[PDB]
Amino acid sequence: SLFNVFNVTGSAMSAESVRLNTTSSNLANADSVSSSAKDTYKARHAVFGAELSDTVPVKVMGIVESDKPLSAEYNPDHPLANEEGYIYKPNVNVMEEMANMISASRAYQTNVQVADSSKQMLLRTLQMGQ
Amino acid sequence: DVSLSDVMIARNKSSVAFDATVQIRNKLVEAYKDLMNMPV
Amino acid sequence: ASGAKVGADFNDLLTKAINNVNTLQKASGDLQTRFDRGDADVSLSDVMIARNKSSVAFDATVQIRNKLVEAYKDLMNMPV
Amino acid sequence: ASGAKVGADFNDLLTKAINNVNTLQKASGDLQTRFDRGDADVSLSDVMIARNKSSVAFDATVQIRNKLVEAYKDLMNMPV
Amino acid sequence: AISFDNALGIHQHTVGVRERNAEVISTNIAQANTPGYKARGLDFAKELQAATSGDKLYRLPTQPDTGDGNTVDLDLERNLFMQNQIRHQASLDFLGSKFKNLTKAIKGE
Amino acid sequence: AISFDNALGIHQHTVGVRERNAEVISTNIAQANTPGYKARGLDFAKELQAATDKLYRLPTQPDTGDGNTVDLDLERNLFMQNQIRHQASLDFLGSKFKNLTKAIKGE
Amino acid sequence: AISFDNALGIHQHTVGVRERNAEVISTNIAQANTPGYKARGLDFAKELQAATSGDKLYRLPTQPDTGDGNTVDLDLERNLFMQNQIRHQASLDFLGSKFKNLTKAIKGE
Amino acid sequence: AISFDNALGIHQHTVGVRERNAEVISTNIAQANTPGYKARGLDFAKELQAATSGKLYRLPTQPDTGDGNTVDLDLERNLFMQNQIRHQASLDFLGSKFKNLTKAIKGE
Amino acid sequence: EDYSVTLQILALMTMLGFLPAMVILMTSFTRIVVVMSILRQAMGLQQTPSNQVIIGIALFLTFFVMSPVLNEINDKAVQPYLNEQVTAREAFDAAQAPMKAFMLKQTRIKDLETFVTMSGEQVDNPEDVSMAVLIPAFITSELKTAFQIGFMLFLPFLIIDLVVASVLMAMGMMMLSPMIVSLPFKLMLFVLVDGWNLILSTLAGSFA
Amino acid sequence: EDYSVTLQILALMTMLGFLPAMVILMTSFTRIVVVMSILRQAMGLQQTPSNQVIIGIALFLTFFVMSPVLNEINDKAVQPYLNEQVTAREAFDAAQAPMKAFMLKQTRIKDLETFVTMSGEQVDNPEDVSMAVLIPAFITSELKTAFQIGFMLFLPFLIIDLVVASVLMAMGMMMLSPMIVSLPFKLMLFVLVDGWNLILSTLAGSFA
Amino acid sequence: DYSVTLQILALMTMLGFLPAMVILMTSFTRIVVVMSILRQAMGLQQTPSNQVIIGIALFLTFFVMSPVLNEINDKAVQPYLNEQVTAREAFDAAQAPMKAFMLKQTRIKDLETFVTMSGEQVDNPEDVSMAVLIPAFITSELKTAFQIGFMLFLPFLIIDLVVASVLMAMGMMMLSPMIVSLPFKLMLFVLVDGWNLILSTLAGSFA
Amino acid sequence: EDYSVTLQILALMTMLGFLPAMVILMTSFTRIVVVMSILRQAMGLQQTPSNQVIIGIALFLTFFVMSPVLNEINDKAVQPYLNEQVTAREAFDAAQAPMKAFMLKQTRIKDLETFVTMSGEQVDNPEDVSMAVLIPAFITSELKTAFQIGFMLFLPFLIIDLVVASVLMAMGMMMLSPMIVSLPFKLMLFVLVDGWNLILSTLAGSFA
Amino acid sequence: EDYSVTLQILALMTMLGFLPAMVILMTSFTRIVVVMSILRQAMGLQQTPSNQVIIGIALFLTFFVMSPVLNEINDKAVQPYLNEQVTAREAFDAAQAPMKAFMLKQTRIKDLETFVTMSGEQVDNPEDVSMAVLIPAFITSELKTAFQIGFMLFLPFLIIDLVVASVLMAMGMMMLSPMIVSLPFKLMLFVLVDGWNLILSTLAGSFA
Amino acid sequence: EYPTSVVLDWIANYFWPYVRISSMLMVMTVTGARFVSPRIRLYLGLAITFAVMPAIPAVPQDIELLSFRGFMTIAEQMIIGIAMGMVTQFMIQTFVLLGQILGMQSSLLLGQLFMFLTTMFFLATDGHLKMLQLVVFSFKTLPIGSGSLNAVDFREMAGWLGIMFQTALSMSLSGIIALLTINLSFGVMTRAAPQLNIFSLGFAFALMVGLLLCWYILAGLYSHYEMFWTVGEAQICRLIRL
């Protein structure tokens, strides 16, 4: 009630934090062949949501795996290969992970400014009539 | 449902209202005391 | 209606505000020590939000207290 | 329940707080002078923690004194 | 006369609207990256009229979206938030001086 | 109640532990080249118990004849994390007195 | 017992000593390439004691000079200058609080 | 006696002189590339005395490259930096003179 | 054009500060106190009624006789002003007029002529003379009127005292002070005729 | 080089601070107040007219008799000052000149002679004397003039008091107090002579 | 419980209400009124001065109410400093010793009047709320102070009547008796050791 | 040695705070104030000259009688001080000497002897006593000297009161108060003798 | 353990706050003011000596009689404290001891007995009571002593008042006020006896 | 809710009842005395208003604290309070009138003797408690919002001067007749020899008997006070329309 801006800016901070964690996992598991062909790691992405029934908070609605086909590689030497000597690798694209890293960091720090400036307006309100 | 603006406005309105009624009460009493202390 | 009902209603308004300020201060304190002890389920953003609200809430408490005391000090300096 | 007994008791209560403030200030000063002189086994955190404690303790001492002096003046200057 | 309405003016309703606008602007900034979210605008004149005695406006994008569907121009949102904060500070100064002048007259100090 | 132990919480002790942790990581980086040195790790919960130790780090890779178990990739990351958390502890403990002084002075 | 010597402690003297140390370190950095120049060092314990109750030493080289006779280890001099600068600021904060504490006690505010 | 000449001391004149010295150094830096320009200095001791009771040429450390310009740019930066530091100190001293003067006439 | 809320408050507090003056210079307080001063002086009591009750009775008597004019001010000035029907400037004038009319009803033509010539101004109608000149003429008439009433009140007590003195002298006792004997007779005749009620009728009704 | 606006305001605020001193020393307030005081004590009434009413009457009288000099200040020192026609230093002199002239018309040369010698300044013409010397001379003259008028008004009341005492002593009722019987006649004479209008008119006409 | 920051603010605020507590809860009220009445009894108007009158009352209200301060200290201050009791319980533990003292130093009739005016149903005198006991205490103490003070007035009124009648006996009707009675009024108070007699009874009057 | 500019201002601002004390203790204000009070008591009027007027005349007269001292202070102290001919130490001492000389000239030996023995200091000559031992002695002598002058003025009005009281008693009227009858003659005696000029000239001349 | 410098500054800055209380309670200022207050009432003049002059002479008197105790404080507590011979608490105790000796010297036993019993502490010798119980006993003793001195000084003026009132009644002029006809003789008695010196001498003598 | 309504109402619901209570105290016989300090009286008025708050009905919310109508409300609360206070002053001063008429007839401060004793009567009969009960009852039957003293109340209160003299004469009629008859008897009995006369000899005789008669007056004064208080209390209830 007295801190509506904080609940929205703070929600963005929590929302954008999850997207950076997801990006870190995608880049750290870009070369994890693992085993089989369906347990292989796939690029994960958070889903943001806004319920507009004032302020509309941003809520993460779960992590969703990418629909891109797995990157196939011919390697009849890896013991975890298949009949045709193929090892399927995660469908992680480095260029899209770099862009998400730039977008997440900048958007996260933008909400810091709004939340920090929101406190100043509250502090100035207490000085009304003084 | 309430904000700091409403709280501060409520605080300021109460302070002005309280200061108004005290001074007028003070003025009337001083007027009464002046009338009582006069040479008949 | 009597004047005690208005006084009780004013008293409950002050008690509710103090509890709300106290709730925020305790909520901020727990989040500060949860992140400080090293719990990985606490975000620095939520901690800073928590202590920002508690600091603003207490500052509002100080302002109301000073006005109440100033009014009382004004009240005692009156002809009677 | 005698006048001298309670007078000593509140004096003991009052002198205990003064000694507590004096202990914090001496400890703060001792930590500052050891770190400032070059002692290796003194951390800046201990120095900063102690001097923050002394400032708060001395600030309370001044504020409590102001309340007592104002209260004394209020009772002495009343229009009897 | 001699009433708080006639004394404070519109500086009491304006403050509430400016805080409402900041909540709307901050929402657009937070929801900038959410796909499909449409930027929300606020009419100050209509809001001030409603506040004095008492609908959804959307902001037309300057350029097409890149596919997500979000029409939040973060360059404009920061500029409007900066302007809103300045005008809100003036309104607090305007409203704060109304109470100070009223207290000054009722006490002659 | 109303005592510094309760007013400051555990933030009065965390700053000291983050300083000790930074010292140990600095030792590990410096002693990375000296053979026979075993990397030392500090257990956070131990100094938590000491408030209300100096262990050894098991290597993830074998040595190369030096016997030195310091991984410079790990030490840099652990020094970065400790420094960031150390600043937050200063912010937490610093604001404890700022709120405490505002309560007493009322301004 | 109320006197500046008792109230300011040793912090009124430490600031001057660390300023002297900075000058001694700085002239070692500047004279790093001058051959025949021996790096100079100032003992803190002796200098502080001399200041309290009213001649810089030589710094031994860790490695031989390369034929110029200069024994300034510019790698070491930077480290000492950085440490002295931080300790100089810490003494300023200690000494500065001594006057502020006296003022608030005198003025009662 | 109580007067501003005795209350402010020399700090009223020192501030002005260092502002002039800033201009002299500033015009040296700008004319660094102008051939035939000779770097000029200001004697603080002499200028301060003139102001209290009331443009020399700098010698080059090395011969000029041929243009005729004797402005040593790294020396100008060092002199401007020191002049700016002492100018702030002069403002600090002179400003505190008025504040202590106001405290005496007001009593608090 | 109309005064701002801040300025109207300043004017309101100013009139409250001058409130004792308006009672003793514009209302009927001066006449009542002077008449009651004569009544205390006429009887043998010097300070016996005390100053406090005389002023308090005078204040209540004024509120009784000023009730028509105060109600007229309330209706004409306060009610339109509270309902925001009229501006503050005209409301102040609407309140001033009933006071001016009442002061004209208790003044004399000769008194007005002296002060209007004294002020050195030009006027032809007594109804639009400035209140600054009406006030000295009003109280001057009030003092003269009060002395007239007080003189009439003093006569019966002088009558009683002279009779008692003559009786004592005629009986031959030239040694007894008439005051001690006359005082009960003056008080008894003041009570059995209900003197104060008669004085109320001739004082409250004297204004009309 | 007239005084700066900040100094001009500081001077005017200081004059308002000394406003009671200006009224009680440099104006006609003192003489009227003293004459009213003597008249009140002349009759049997101690403080029946009350102190506030006496000062209230005097304040209006002293404002009316000094309206000519007040207007002369306005027409020669205020309006030229507001119209940006005279230096503020000149306007202050233009305001002080009529006030000095008025005080000289109501002063006695003996009062000027003793204070000029007291100040020890070599001044001959009785028009260029300092306000430091003129004010004590003026207030001294006003006190002496008020006593003369007070004695003049006292005599008829002394005549009544002696006659009443003599008549009572003729009948042999020496025990009867003459003051109680004298008072209604003192009120009688003062009211059929129209005293209140008469005295205020004479006091107004006295300052000339 | 309330946070540390809030409970510091609470005690700091009520630290400024200490003069308020003294005037309407402890024995400061009765002594000052009796002192003021006796001051008016003699011909001297402000010879004892207000500050000296207050200073004597402050010393008296500490000696007389010393048992009250002892119980508050050992029952409220001591448990709180040992963490044996919380903030609200300690504050309640201090009210009980002071409420008991005020209850025993009031008049039944005044309490009966006040409970009727307050509109609360209480069956026994010792269970009345402090909100109604404080006005009842000062109202009763005012009556006690007036009754005690005016009895001290009587001997000084006796001297005035004696000297005034004696002066009127000789026909000296113009000599003011008050200036003649003033030397004898002072002598009566010093012969009976008045400054010790009134204070001894005032101290012993409370319970 | 010489006090700093900040300290000189602090000392000067301190003396302004004690200016009222120096007026009523170290100047002629007290004696003139006392004499007028006794002179007012001698006449029948107790509040007719008015406290404000009496203090106003006392302030004007104390400015005239202290002018030789003030001019000496200006010449000896201020002029060397403003021209930087003496330090702040010498200027303050040079200012104190004329003021001490004035108080020594109006004091009494016995009063000086009384406080010298009380202060316990070894003093050889009166002209070098400390300031702290002179101020209580000077004000003591002024009060005693004021009483002597007041007794002189009280006698002529007392004689008139006694004369008129005996004349009334001779004619047998023992109930008429002599105070009422004597008052007109008390005022007249002060008028035809020109009292307000005679008394003030003597008071000013009493310091020479 | 000596207190820190900050606390010591805060401790003695609080003494300045309580300085007026010490003068009116623990010093000789109380008796001197009372005696001169009663002395003023003994003479006819109501407020001629004025409150400020009475306080001024009292301040000089209380400074001269408390010099030995002030000198003892300096030579026992202040000098060792400035010279680092004793700590803060020892200096505080060394300063209090001469003050306690002065109050106990000029107090009454019964007054000490009255307060020791009420406080409820064991006492076997006079020099064991806490300052909390000595202050109220000392002021009570001073008031009784001041009243006794005032009574003696009042008697000679009472004799004059009785004589002059009786003499007027001998001639039969009862209406003539004795107070007016006695003030010159009361003032003259205070002059030729030289009251302002011996009375202050007795007040100084009474404390030693 | 908007917090303005809650805070403003309590100030309106407390100060307005307090003003009437405080105004009665400053004019009251005991609480308005010169002995008590204003601070003690101020705290008494604050404590009484807080305690009797439940019995006070809620003030109308139509009138605003910052408005000219609210300003009039403050003034008319004082007028009610002063009305009760003046009645108490009327009774005590009537006894002061009784004291001085006896003293004047006694060839003679005697009002103070009656004033002090009448103050004891006021305190002993719990007169102060009754007045406090009257003012709280005034809140019930004479509400703060709508209601003030009318013109008839002013005239009834102005007519109390006749009540003073009639009651004072009624109390002293028996004694004053006794004073006259003994003085007349003394005059006629000693009129045989005009050499003796009375003068001061009559002063001594008159004052001795007058003091003796005052001893008789104090013997039966209590009954007169009880009847007088009933008359005064009835007037107070008439003011508050009870």
TrEMBL record, chain A:
GO BP: any one term: bacterial-type flagellum-dependent swarming motility
Highest taxon listed in the record's lineage: Bacteria
Annotated TM spans: none
Residue span(s) of domain Flagellar basal body rod protein N-terminal: 7-31
Full protein name: Flagellar basal-body rod protein FlgC
Compartments where located: Bacterial flagellum basal body
Entry GO CC: bacterial-type flagellum basal body, rod
Residue ranges occupied by any Flagellar basal-body/hook protein C-terminal domain in the UniProt entry: 84-128
Keywords per UniProt: Bacterial flagellum, Cell projection, Cilium, Flagellum
Principal location class: other
Subunit structure: The basal body constitutes a major portion of the flagellar organelle and consists of four rings (L,P,S, and M) mounted on a central rod. The rod consists of about 26 subunits of FlgG in the distal portion, and FlgB, FlgC and FlgF are thought to build up the proximal portion of the rod with about 6 subunits each.
PANTHER family: FLAGELLAR BASAL-BODY ROD PROTEIN FLGC, FLAGELLAR PROTEIN
Family according to the record: Belongs to the flagella basal body rod proteins family.
UniProt organism field: Vibrio alginolyticus
Gene (UniProt): flgC
Automatic annotation (TrEMBL), chains E, G:
Its biological purpose: Structural component of flagellum, the bacterial motility apparatus. Part of the rod structure of flagellar basal body.
GO cellular component: bacterial-type flagellum basal body, rod
Keywords: Bacterial flagellum, Cell projection, Cilium, Flagellum
Family statement drawn from the similarity comment of this UniProt entry: Belongs to the flagella basal body rod proteins family.
Subcellular location: Bacterial flagellum basal body
Protein's recorded name: Flagellar basal body rod protein FlgB
A biological-process GO annotation: bacterial-type flagellum-dependent cell motility
Organism: Vibrio alginolyticus
InterPro entries to which the protein is assigned, alphabetical: FlgB (IPR006300)
Major site of localization recorded for this protein: other
Subunit structure: The basal body constitutes a major portion of the flagellar organelle and consists of a number of rings mounted on a central rod.
Signal peptide: none
Automatic annotation (TrEMBL), chain N:
Transmembrane parts of this sequence: 11-30, 42-59, 79-103, 109-129, 163-186, 198-218
Domain of life: Bacteria
Keywords: Bacterial flagellum, Cell membrane, Cell projection, Cilium, Flagellum, Membrane, Transmembrane, Transmembrane helix
GO cellular component terms given for this protein: bacterial-type flagellum basal body; plasma membrane
GO biological process: bacterial-type flagellum assembly; protein targeting
Family assignment from sequence similarity: Belongs to the FliR/MopE/SpaR family.
Biological function: Role in flagellar biosynthesis.
Protein name (record): Flagellar biosynthetic protein FliR
Organism: Vibrio alginolyticus
Gene that this sequence comes from: fliR
